[PDB]
Amino acid sequence: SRVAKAPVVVPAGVDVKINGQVITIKGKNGELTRTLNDAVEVKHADNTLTFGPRDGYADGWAQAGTARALLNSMVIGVTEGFTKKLQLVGVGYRAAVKGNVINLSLGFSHPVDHQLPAGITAECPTQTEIVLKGADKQVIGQVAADLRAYRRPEPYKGKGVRYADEVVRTKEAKKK
Amino acid sequence: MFDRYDAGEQAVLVHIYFTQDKDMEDLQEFESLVSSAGVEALQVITGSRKAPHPKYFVGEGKAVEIAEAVKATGASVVLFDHALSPAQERNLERLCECRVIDRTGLILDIFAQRARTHEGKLQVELAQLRHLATRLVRGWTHLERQKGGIGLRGPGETQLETDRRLLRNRIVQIQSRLERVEKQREQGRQSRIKADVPTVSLVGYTNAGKSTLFNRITEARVYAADQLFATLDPTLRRIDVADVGETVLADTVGFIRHLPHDLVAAFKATLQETRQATLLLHVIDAADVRVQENIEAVNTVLEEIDAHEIPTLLVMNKIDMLEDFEPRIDRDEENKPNRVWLSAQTGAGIPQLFQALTERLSGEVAQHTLRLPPQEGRLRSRFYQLQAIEKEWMEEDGSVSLQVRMPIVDWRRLCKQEPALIDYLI
Amino acid sequence: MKVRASVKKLCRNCKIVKRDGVIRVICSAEPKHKQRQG
RNA sequence: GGUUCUCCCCGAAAGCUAUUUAGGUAGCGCCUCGUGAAUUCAUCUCCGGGGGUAGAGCACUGUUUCGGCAAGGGGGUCAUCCCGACUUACCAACCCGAUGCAAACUGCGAAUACCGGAGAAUGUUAUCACGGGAGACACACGGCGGGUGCUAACGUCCGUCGUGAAGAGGGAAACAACCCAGACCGCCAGCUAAGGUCCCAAAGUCAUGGUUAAGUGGGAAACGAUGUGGGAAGGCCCAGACAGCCAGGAUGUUGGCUUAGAAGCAGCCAUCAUUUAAAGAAAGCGUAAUAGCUCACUGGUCGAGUCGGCCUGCGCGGAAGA
RNA sequence: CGAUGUCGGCUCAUCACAUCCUGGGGCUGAAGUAGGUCCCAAGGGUAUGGCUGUUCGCCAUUUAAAGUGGUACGCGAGCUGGGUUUAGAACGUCGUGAGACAGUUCGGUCCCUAUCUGCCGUGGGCGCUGGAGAACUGAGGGGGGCUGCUCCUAGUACGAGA
RNA sequence: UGCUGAAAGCAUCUAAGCACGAAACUUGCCCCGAGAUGAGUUCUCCCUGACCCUUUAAGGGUCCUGAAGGAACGUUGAAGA
């Protein structure tokens, strides 16, 4: 793994503490600990976390690559937010934040609500799309996927999470 | 599965030379379809003064003359079928106990080897099931004699009821697949057909060249040979002409003389669009006495399925040798019984069908390309890219061929959808 | 999604993966080009 | 159908022929008992033989593919086959070269079997003849050689061997025919064969090296696959190696063919040429040619492996039954 | 062959899933209603009649649906005899005849007191470590498991309309 | 159908992790159910007298006392062969 051959650079504002196989991080965005590793060691002495195979399992290189990507993700999480630009368009499709509960009136007979988990914040400057901020990109990706799985983008409308003027491939069936 | 006797070895084509009643009998279209299927005969022998035998449909001396070739191949050509629930027709079916490859198989083999369309392939394989059914369902006698009739007791049904029921299950599953093919084809017809379709079908003497005609006339040509390819079989496709545009016809394969009627029952997949057609046009030269049984059969079919009140316009056949003169406008009455100057090679001339297709639709002025200085931005070049037809004749001031043509509903929608800022029309 | 026993690369955008124990193709261009079980 | 007490010794056959015969019987082969004979009989070595099986070969009998031009037709003007325009775009009948295929082909030809000699050693003379007494003539599986069948059958019919029949004991869970091995009797004895040593269930949680991660082991084929292990090579390369990417691509590259689209979805002349890292009358694709890559491509900050193919070990999917 | 009773129906069922309906998905020439195909799924449900003995088959009409197979082509010590399984008689055909028919027609005797296994219920003896009276915990086991129509959301989503 | 993600600097639902997902599975609902010999638990009630032979936790016989409770028997039941 040549991504595991590159340690992750840690700035002065991010504090890293290792407790055995458990990695705990500190930042301005928040304290977070999700991942504890199995066959990859971590240490640092020159402000760069190292990722190494322990023995000859022929897999700990790949696990060290995963650990490098995970630590890069949590460093960028504790300095900045991750996922924005969640758009879901439709006729009478509304969304307004209220605490950790968000409503999605998307053409259903019942109104539906999504309970946002701890460590996420959602804002919507306009009715049809919602912008998120989070320190865990796995959690914000699961939340954005759940909000996109409440109403799946059909090909005839052309919805989905798109950035600026980006086009979802639109089917042109039934053109009489 | 559907295994038959082995082929690929030379035999004769058995046909009675002198029936002394219909006569004519040129063999050219018959031998051309033998060529098209590729049925091979290295040496051709003719039976001089051979009247037909109504008793056994074959001669003993003729049979033992071909028997040297039968000792290699193992079959001969014996025609006819039409066996049904009487035991007399059971006797009629068993009457050809001799070594037989049927005319139905020899005719259907070309489309069977090279079947383009799917509905025609399903119908020709169920017709294959019918001609094995003629010798199987009506042919219970030989295994009844051989086996000793064990298994008939119990149910009151006939012998070999399991085999007949299994074949009936075959035709039920194939006809259900046919009905689902018909469902998806009618779904396609709902997508294509807009309230009318101007179709005919025309058959007769062979050697037409329908796909060569298609890629030659549609101004979109395919590299191909003059000999027959897998390009064949009757398909409804668009016809390029000088002036009208969208006409749709079948491209029918060359028709066989004098003994299709169960064969047109097999070919009812092609002939299904014949009945729903309003216009009825066909190309037959009237010098033939052999075609009189087929004329009577066509008239009986017309009396059966009705809709024969519209008179048929004439286009005459066998014009391919003379090419003697140009078309000339001669008017005696409104029926105009005049000759037809059709040529497959040169376009000139098709004037009577041009006159009919032009008299169907007229008023080619309603297109109006607006005269304004060119601007940049939205909604430009859409009317350029929309639709037009015909060819270009030299005119000034921008009266370019680009057309829209819709009925009264978009005649009403013309005043609603467009703001009409030009303020020229009132 | 086909369950054909011979899984092919139907187009250039098709990509094969091994998920759980089975092997399947995923296509980012044409949705009918994906299958299973080969 | 039944056929009644004991011990000891030997020990089959289910084949050939004939049969108003096919489930019976007669003769012979096989069994037992008794006389007689002889380096008689087996085995191994050496010696003398005949073969046409396996395999091969295509000269013959046939079959079969390709390449080498005519005596005459398919015929070429052919009522100019002109004793000269014929003599081709097929067989040049035949013949030559290469490649196959045969139970009823052999210009070749094994291993084995078989017959006959000489020699030792072993074998209760096993071998042969005659005489007394039978049984049997319904066979089965497995290996090998086949006919038939579908190179199906616990199918049928043969040759040969082994087993059961008529042979127990050990193993393969259970099992006549498979493997090991032929039980005179007794022992609370040792070694071993096939098979095995985690518990049932006796004996290695033995040692070394490797493989697989699927419960393979412990049901199954074509085919599909960056599963993984080994091997031998090839292309790129510190004239920066494979990735991903800001940016870059114009005047005959708008001549002809629904011409204010020929040019990217319909093909032929056609890329001579220019600011040839890059000039594209664009194929694979594409939304409404005017978003993008392989595009004949790269100055590139970016830096030690990368990409295909060949063979082989063990795996994965194809894989659904009451 | 020192007897394993032959179809169909009735009564009662049980299993496999190669799934008829209901359930969850993919793809679609899936705009919506409606379809086609493929994957997962056996929990439950899975017609009444006219015709002739029918399995079949035709048809009327219904239902969301009227599944395909195995269970001695399930089930005769559970039932039936409409048909072959007889003996009487007749027609057609064959046979100079007795007779025959993988043809037809009329008629034509179906026993069992349940020992064992198996089930459905129900008790007696003992055990449960002094003997009783009564409540329970729940290891196990069974039962149940279907679905139509109408209305609101809404004539909204979609569709040029219908 | 997915998120994050390397192996395989790109990608990827999976190998490490994680989140959805059906009348199928386990519970949920209703019955039998400690013969559940793995014979269970809780509350209550009742019995606290002697002598011989002893082949010994020993074990048998004699006199007295024989409780809590059960059984028997009659009257029977919308329980029952």
UniProtKB/TrEMBL annotation, chain C:
At the top level, the lineage of the source is Bacteria
> What name has this protein been given in UniProt?
Large ribosomal subunit protein bL36
Instruction: Cite the entry's keywords alphabetically.
Output: Metal-binding, Ribonucleoprotein, Ribosomal protein, Zinc
Q: List the disulfide bonds.
A: 11-14, 11-27
The species this protein was found in: Escherichia coli (strain UMEA 3162-1)
Which GO cellular component does the record give, naming just one? cytoplasm
Q: Which HAMAP family match?
A: Ribosomal_bL36
**InterPro entries given in the database record:** Ribosomal_bL36, Ribosomal_bL36_sp
Q: Which Gene Ontology biological process is one annotated for this entry?
A: translation
Instruction: Indicate the family of this protein.
Output: Belongs to the bacterial ribosomal protein bL36 family.
Cited NCBIfam families: rpmJ_bact
UniProt: Zn(2+) binding residues: 11, 14, 27, 33
Zinc keyword on record: yes
What are the protein's GO molecular function terms? structural constituent of ribosome
